[model samples]
Target: RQKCDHWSPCPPDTYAYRLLSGGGRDKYAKICFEDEVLIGEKTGNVARGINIAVVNYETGKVIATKYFDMYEGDNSGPMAKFIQSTPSKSLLFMVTHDDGSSKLKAQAKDAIEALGSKEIKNMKFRSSWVFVAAKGFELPSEIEREKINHSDQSRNRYAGWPAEIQIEGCIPKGLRD
Candidate 1:
């Protein structure tokens, strides 16, 4: 948590995390997770800058995917609504965090502003686990339509893939937080 650089101090959501993993040390435990949901205030795209997967609880198809490039992420109405309305199994978050930019106060504050009260409150932690099932989420066409620049290392980090979603949520079998 020092100056802003390649590996600045970035954290994740606490409540949702604890609710899932209980903060454990399980490596294989997080192999097939959904993605991160960081909303620290504003380092890049705030809470919007997450790798999310919205799957139908029954159908198990990933209806949407949000793996933005650089600042390609922002508050998404559809994603948020799906999270609020659907059950836990319908919303699977992978390796998500809430830690904003400690080095840049302005950016951190900006991130917070983008988040809602519930998201705003979760703080100071890193979560790595599967709150829901993994292994059957269908990738939406919109995600494939976007071209990923091979030369850019950052774009490669957007390396999100598909996984099957569960109808009911699960306790973190393996966790790293």
Candidate 2:
């Protein structure tokens, strides 16, 4: 009934969140927190690359949202800086659209690894990935936080790409306490 419309309602002391990776082309990825579209096609911020959204964890408010094109230009360095610049006590959400790994570099992967992402190093061309991480705290072990799906050339779901992936859950606001 609130936020991302999960199967059940989240408690008053919790926040509802969802992260969905793009499905093939044109579908676009989306990041929703506390029922707000922090990043998505509707918000007009999504593009062909890795999309990111940062939020103030304690207040459940959005801080910023951006995208980095991994298929063109030299964005890995800038993307690393963006991740490193996030302040403490914040939540970071990420999703990939189009080609996210064709031009990814070590620094960008390292930045994601620092945020507790285990699959960043394994991402391949056009891999569908979604992740949620905390800056100064630990998320509950029970919540769905990350997912990845690599494209299968033999039987790709859509052309040369894999299907979309997603993770949705309720995060307790009392985590820092």
Candidate 3:
């Protein structure tokens, strides 16, 4: 966690969790990064940091995308929520960010497991890519983009972020020998 102190700027410690970073087998789990958002002030469409795209690796398409309200943004909670919703691809890649209070971390761990995949209870990752982006960021699979476009509030559901994308083990093959 100390490794990312400089890069991390989330506040109040209670809500300090974030997706510091990690990816997956052949893009099975691609994280929508804050840096990836293009800010076009001229277009009046500001590039935002609190958005996450759950991507389909093969087609390089988006399974879904969600935007949240975070000053710097953190996807820790949404990833966990996605894992719960998606069977987690066996947690074959990536994990949550553990930067909050131990109590909060425990709650997040339980919440993540509750969302699905009790396997997270035993899984681990050793190395990882790192970044902090959106929270929540989940939309129902059946939800349409047109409705989302019409209702700005429909884009995101409100919740305090646990940012538990990092667990005890985070092994990033790309960063390791």
Candidate 4:
């Protein structure tokens, strides 16, 4: 299959990426880069929270991958720390598996907002959100970077969860603002 399972192959000078948010209860969030499953259901690392994968933009290698539960526990601080600690010139992909906003704090939201997520503060309970952010440079404006699906009792795809949302596209190597 093509990189990130895209129907068409990405150009030689570009990277392929795909971010998918969780669907119903059983379905989990997923993130793919350069044909690799950076984070996904098969990785056994995804959980009910905000899933994140950091990549070295220059080397096309994974820097780190983790998930923070926003539904329970005091993970907001840790999540923000992780985001702040990520090295510059890195690519960050984030997706919500379940409840990513119920316990979210201002610090974490600020960290995400600094990365250029306009929808981070607008997230709601059980909202399916996916975002791709760059640490040192700006991603192309034309590329799809973020998407969200809010949970609605009357229109939810699942009993209490919103439909999954996804954003996929190619990112040119050595891109800059």
RMSD of each: 17.0, 1.2, 17.1, 1.4
TM-score for all models, in order of appearance: 0.28, 0.96, 0.24, 0.96
- Clashes found in each candidate (C-alpha, N, C closer than 3 A): 20, 0, 24, 0
Which portions of model 3 show Cα errors greater than 4 Å? 1-51, 67-79, 87-107, 110-177
lDDT of 4 by residue, 1-177 (tens): 777888777878898999999897788899999888989878888888899999999899999999999989999999999999999899999999988999999999999999999999999999999999999888989989998889899989999999999998999996852
| Per-residue lDDT of 85 in model 4 | 99
By TM-score, the better pick of 1 and 3 is 1
Q: What is the lDDT of candidate 3?
A: 0.28
> How many backbone overlaps does candidate 4 show?
0
The sequence of per-residue lDDT tens digits that candidate 1 reaches over residues 1-177 is 221221223233211221121112211111122223231222132231234444544443445544321123333443344344444334344323221112213333233233221232332222122222223232222211111111123432222311211111222322322
Assess candidate 4 and give its TM-score to the true structure: 0.96
Q: How far off is residue 122 in model 2, in Å?
A: 0.6
TM-score of 2: 0.96
lDDT of each residue in 10-109, candidate 2, tens digit only: 8788889989999999788999888888888889899888999999998888898999999999999999999999999999999998878989999999
